[PDB]
Design an enzyme around this catalytic site. Sequence first.
Site, PDB file in Angstrom:
ATOM      1  N   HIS A  41       3.622  14.065  -0.754  1.00  0.00           N
ATOM      2  CA  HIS A  41       2.197  13.935  -0.477  1.00  0.00           C
ATOM      3  C   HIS A  41       1.891  13.092   0.772  1.00  0.00           C
ATOM      4  O   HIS A  41       0.720  12.904   1.082  1.00  0.00           O
ATOM      5  CB  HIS A  41       1.400  13.441  -1.701  1.00  0.00           C
ATOM      6  CG  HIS A  41       1.629  12.010  -2.101  1.00  0.00           C
ATOM      7  ND1 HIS A  41       0.934  10.966  -1.499  1.00  0.00           N
ATOM      8  CD2 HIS A  41       2.382  11.505  -3.108  1.00  0.00           C
ATOM      9  CE1 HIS A  41       1.335   9.862  -2.117  1.00  0.00           C
ATOM     10  NE2 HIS A  41       2.199  10.136  -3.097  1.00  0.00           N
ATOM     11  N   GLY A 137      -0.675   2.042  -1.998  1.00  0.00           N
ATOM     12  CA  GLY A 137       0.372   1.860  -0.997  1.00  0.00           C
ATOM     13  C   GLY A 137       1.773   1.650  -1.548  1.00  0.00           C
ATOM     14  O   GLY A 137       2.726   1.510  -0.775  1.00  0.00           O
ATOM     15  N   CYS A 139       3.485   3.898  -3.369  1.00  0.00           N
ATOM     16  CA  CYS A 139       4.146   5.210  -3.448  1.00  0.00           C
ATOM     17  C   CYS A 139       5.441   5.164  -2.656  1.00  0.00           C
ATOM     18  O   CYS A 139       5.450   4.635  -1.551  1.00  0.00           O
ATOM     19  CB  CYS A 139       3.227   6.309  -2.923  1.00  0.00           C
ATOM     20  SG  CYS A 139       1.630   6.422  -3.769  1.00  0.00           S
TER      21      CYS A 139
END
Lengths: 299, 305
Positions: A41, A137, A139
């Site tokens: 993503h 943030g 991820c």
Amino acid sequence: SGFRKMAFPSGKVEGCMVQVTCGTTTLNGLWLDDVVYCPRHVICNPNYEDLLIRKSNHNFLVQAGNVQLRVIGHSMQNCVLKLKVDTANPKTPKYKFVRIQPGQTFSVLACYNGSPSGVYQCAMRPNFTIKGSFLNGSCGSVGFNIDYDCVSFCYMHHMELPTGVHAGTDLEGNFYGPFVDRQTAQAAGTDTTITVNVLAWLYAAVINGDRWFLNRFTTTLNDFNLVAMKYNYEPLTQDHVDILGPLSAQTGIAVLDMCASLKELLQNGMNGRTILGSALLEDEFTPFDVVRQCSGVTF
Amino acid sequence: SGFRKMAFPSGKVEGCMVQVTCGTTTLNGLWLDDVVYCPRHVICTSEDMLNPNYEDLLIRKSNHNFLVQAGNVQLRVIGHSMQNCVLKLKVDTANPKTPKYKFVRIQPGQTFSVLACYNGSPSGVYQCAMRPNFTIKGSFLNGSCGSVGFNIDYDCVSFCYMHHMELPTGVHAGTDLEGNFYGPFVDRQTAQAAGTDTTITVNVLAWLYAAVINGDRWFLNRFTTTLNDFNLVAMKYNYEPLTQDHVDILGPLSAQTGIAVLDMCASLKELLQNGMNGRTILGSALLEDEFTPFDVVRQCSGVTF
Ligand SMILES: CNC(=O)CN1C[C@@](C)(C(=O)Nc2cncc3ccccc23)c2cc(Cl)ccc2S1(=O)=O
Ligand SMILES: [Cl-]
């Protein structure tokens, strides 16, 4: 003495955290050899094949510390983006990519901007979510175990569910549970208590001299599982009993002896008492974690 | 979302753990520059523990009697001094992985990460707090002496604790990195027991503010209290007295949630009075005291839910 939730030393994983930026999105990446792994993503009802074909190598900005890494290739394996970098990581540890099963525990190195901020231990819940501690943030921050000199990477963070629980993939991009990487109505299923872990934690309490919960009674596997199913507990298998064998031997308390003690804790409660400083029955310590913490296993 | 007890990444400390051996005893050491720091009881036998004379034992030792091993490489001791309860071994090579560091003496209530080691090899990391009675509820088996406690604030590792001994009740005592014990403990095998422990009140309140930040407000009420009236009730439940310094420290969390410090003290007074009644605050059935106001701010978002 003492029993704590203990993460593995994060050192061999810290040397692998880089910051990946694609346009406006900025998440964390895992640098192993000449490849950086991150959630797919980062390029973002998505069509990742269509979004990725439009991206050039220089559209990805991998930053390792202060140094800027040069992307020279990009592929996609399931829900993970693989960025071929121009330089191999000098601090690449000995590693494996593993798919863990619900019940099994792992350490998480929480990162923001390719910078590690904290380490914590958690378990893969039976509903496939993890009760982690993540803000925006995070991820790309990974979950791992260290068994000998080998860091087995088992999880990559992708998203937070409406109830504050977390969902991610194995290091091949295969999600744990029925989650898809897009903004849709998705929720965590009904969770259960990991029974084999609660028993392992009851054995650690006896190893630390907490015996108030023990009794003269025993039970059978079927009679215990009927009671457990009523309290939202995972069914206890014959494999689970065999796994609790070294602890059953070390303490001298048969697995079905401990099951009768758990049945009673489940029926009438703690009655104002605490086991290992806890007023709840803990299910995030596997039988191996208990043995490792009450032996002194080093890496 | 999500609130966990979180240790600092142990990486910068792992590169400093060496194994120190003197005779038959084998513990852990901290390698910073050309010095290895370790507990001075490394020069003791089990007999020497009753009444040791460390100066008398140390004068009999030469550099080559200390075997510092860093990984597979063997380090050469070229000097030895003693500062309080720690032994400082001057090594012939400076540690290439020496991080940016400070030595800090923390106060009861403060939290830190512990890197548990055996034979100079790290096995696990965990977060804990310096209890008001000066002990720590850690997880240490035999061979873990010389394991350290630390905080990493920016690029700096502030070393605050070195593990020395386990008390009769399973709690742990150690020194700051200058070998000065925390509490009335001595590195002697004598009749010493941990004093009555109390709950760190400023930390329970910080954790209650972290619950409100995550949208847990069930415990709040329409009452307030005076600092004195709160402390009279808190002493009855074995809680540390709340000081005016503590109230000032909770200021940012009080402002962020819109709940005055003495408003939160009223909710804590009622929580102590009633119990949880089957409910949990941040997934816990007990009131948590090992998250300082600084830890809550560091882990929790600025946006309240
Ligand atoms: C169970 N504890 C003991 O028997 C303590 N005795 C041994 C010792 C070396 C000590 O505390 N060692 C340990 C440290 N941490 C953890 C431990 C776990 C298990 C076993 C020993 C552990 C020691 C050190 C000092 Cl500074 C003073 C007194 C003593 S002692 O001779 O009384
Ligand atoms: Cl302090």
